Nucleic acid binder design. Structure first.
Lengths: 48, 475
DNA sequence: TTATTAATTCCATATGGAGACTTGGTTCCGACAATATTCAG
DNA sequence: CTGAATATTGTCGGAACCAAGTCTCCATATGGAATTAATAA
């Protein structure tokens, strides 16, 4: 499917020619800290 | 195991008529004129104090109390009650709190063998509330004498009445009321007072003075490495808190070679760009590497009969292999010699938490016996003309290696994030001249040697503080 | 005129696992005494 | 009018235990070795 290439040297120029922004972020606390004895509230970095 | 033999009548010792092996390992006919709980101490029923809200009180669980009878309380205040510490306030509201009266002793009820007995000193201020998981006793005899007689001595009779019962080995007030303290052991200590208090007070204040200047094994490495290179440690910890990186499509293949675009890699790039803004001595490590031999990890039994094997707990922030093997195998692989530690070897940890993966250390310890290093160790025979292995290991243990390996460690399971040879070959670390590398090594060798000497004197004092008690009791 | 592949074995090795063992002590349900109740002789 | 017994009100006592911290053997490619091999003078 790739065509007898390493795809890295090709992919570099492919991404150079056509480019779009990409969004990345990290959440540290999700707000539903669960244990085998039930759920517990926590700060929610995803949404409010 | 043990093989004893008891009688039916011995089941009448406790009104709970228990006949478990652990309890009756200690049960035996007695000839000493034993004392009882009535003469020595008095259990004080716990009550819920009326805590004020303006003043920030200090609370302490069992986990906050240390093995050596030190308390590290948490400062809580109803004014700032967030979700992180909401559980503590839930315990307080339920009623698991009590203020110890001055002079009492608080024995932890769960897991007595840890010897987590704390003494509320008659002097000093800022009293701290405790969880009702402790047990209050009011010593009719001198409080310090009973404290020391319970920590050092009687540590096995208290452990001989704990009740496990499908879970936690716990105690009860009745268990303490059942104890059978001896007379000579306690009267010898009580009579020989007014010096067995002065000597212990002097030794304890010496230990406190020694602890007053103690520093961790990571801050020292951080301090000197921050002294060089002019790194703002406060700003580095602020940029590390950012959780928003917006890279482009083009900047995904830059030095990637395997197309990694996870968030960890893209924050690694930002942190590494920030770190080397003013440093210009950086060359890739892959040039100065000759081999990346891994280790061998056979099925090992703890304290077995065979060749010893190291573990991931034997690599410390100092940069010296602890050489304290625990596990032992008896299996062979026809190539045993290649998996034996040797003096001068450079081992990097492969597989740990996100913060403890990549720790490096030089052996620096002449041991004639053969010890296997597991396959979680990467040995890195390198060019001994530019790197000066000790410098490399202590750089890796520093924040210059604790942030790269925190964001390059590949792995689906975040609890065993691992580093491969590719990360080692593609790590851009700062290499100063050979003369400059030696200066740092001397600093964070002499400082840590002084710190270790501090760590040794305190242990010797804490050992003689109980040797004195033992020799005073048995006399 | 051979000996280069490039396939087909085969090794010790690098890599990674919706992990998993070790150590310490924590919540929460269920009683339960003591609230209360509780109607009545 | 002297109850003790059921609304319950807050406290012990355990738990086919269980979070916190952090240390692990092993199945599985794999590829560079071997092998067969076809180049071609």
């Amino acid at each position: 499917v790739f065509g007898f290439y390493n795809a890295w040297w090709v992919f570099g120029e492919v991404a150079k020619e056509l480019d779009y922004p990409i969004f990345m972020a990290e959440a540290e606390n999700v707000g539903y800290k669960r244990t085998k004895k039930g759920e517990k509230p926590m700060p929610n970095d995803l949404y409010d | 195991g043990l093989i004893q033999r008891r009688n039916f009548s011995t089941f009448a010792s406790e009104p709970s008529v228990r006949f478990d092996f652990n309890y009756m390992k200690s049960v035996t006919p007695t000839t000493e004129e034993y004392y009882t709980y009535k003469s020595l101490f008095e259990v004080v029923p716990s009550t819920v104090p009326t805590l004020d809200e303006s003043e920030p009180f200090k609370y302490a669980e069992i986990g906050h109390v240390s093995k050596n009878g030190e308390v590290f309380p948490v400062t809580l205040s109803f004014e700032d009650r967030d979700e992180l510490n909401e559980d503590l306030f839930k315990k307080i509201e339920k009623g698991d709190i009590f203020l110890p009266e001055r002079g009492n002793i608080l024995i932890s009820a769960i897991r007595p063998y840890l010897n987590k007995i704390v003494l509320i000193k008659e002097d000093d201020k800022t009293d701290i509330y405790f969880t009702k998981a402790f047990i209050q006793i009011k010593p009719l005899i001198n409080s310090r004498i009973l404290y020391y007689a319970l920590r050092t001595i009687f540590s096995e009779k208290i452990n001989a009445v704990s009740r496990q019962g499908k879970g936690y080995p716990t105690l009860k007030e009745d268990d303490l009321k059942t104890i059978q303290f001896s007379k000579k052991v306690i009267d010898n200590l009580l009579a020989k007072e007014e010096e067995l208090i002065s000597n212990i007070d002097a030794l304890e204040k010496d230990i406190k003075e020694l602890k007053s200047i103690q520093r961790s094994k990571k801050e020292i490495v951080d301090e000197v490495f921050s002294s060089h290179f002019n790194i703002n440690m406060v700003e580095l910890m602020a940029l590390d808190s950012q959780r928003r990186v917006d890279v482009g499509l083009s900047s995904i293949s830059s030095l990637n070679s395997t197309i990694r675009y996870s968030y960890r890699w893209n924050k690694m790039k930002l942190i590494q760009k920030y770190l080397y803004r003013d440093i210009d001595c950086i060359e890739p490590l892959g040039k100065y590497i000759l081999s990346s031999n891994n280790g061998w990890s056979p099925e090992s039994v703890v304290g077995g009969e065979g060749i010893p094997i190291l573990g991931q707990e034997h690599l410390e922030f100092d940069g010296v292999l602890n050489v304290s093997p625990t596990k032992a195998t008896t299996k062979t692989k026809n190539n045993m010699e290649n998996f034996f530690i040797q003096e001068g070897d450079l081992f990097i940890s492969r597989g740990n938490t996100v913060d403890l993966v990549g720790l490096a250390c030089v052996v620096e310890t002449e041991v004639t016996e053969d010890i296997i290093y597991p396959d979680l160790y990467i040995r890195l025979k390198i060019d001994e003309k530019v790197i000066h292995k000790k410098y490399l290991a202590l750089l890796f243990n520093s924040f210059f290696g604790r942030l790269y390996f925190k964001y390059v460690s590949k792995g689906k399971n975040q609890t065993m994030v691992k580093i491969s040879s590719n990360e080692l070959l593609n790590y851009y670390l700062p290499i100063p001249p050979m003369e400059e590398q030696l200066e740092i090594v001397g600093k964070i060798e002499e400082q840590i040697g002084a710190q270790n000497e501090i760590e040794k004197q305190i242990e010797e004092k804490r050992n003689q503080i109980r040797v004195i008690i033992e020799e005073t009791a048995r006399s």
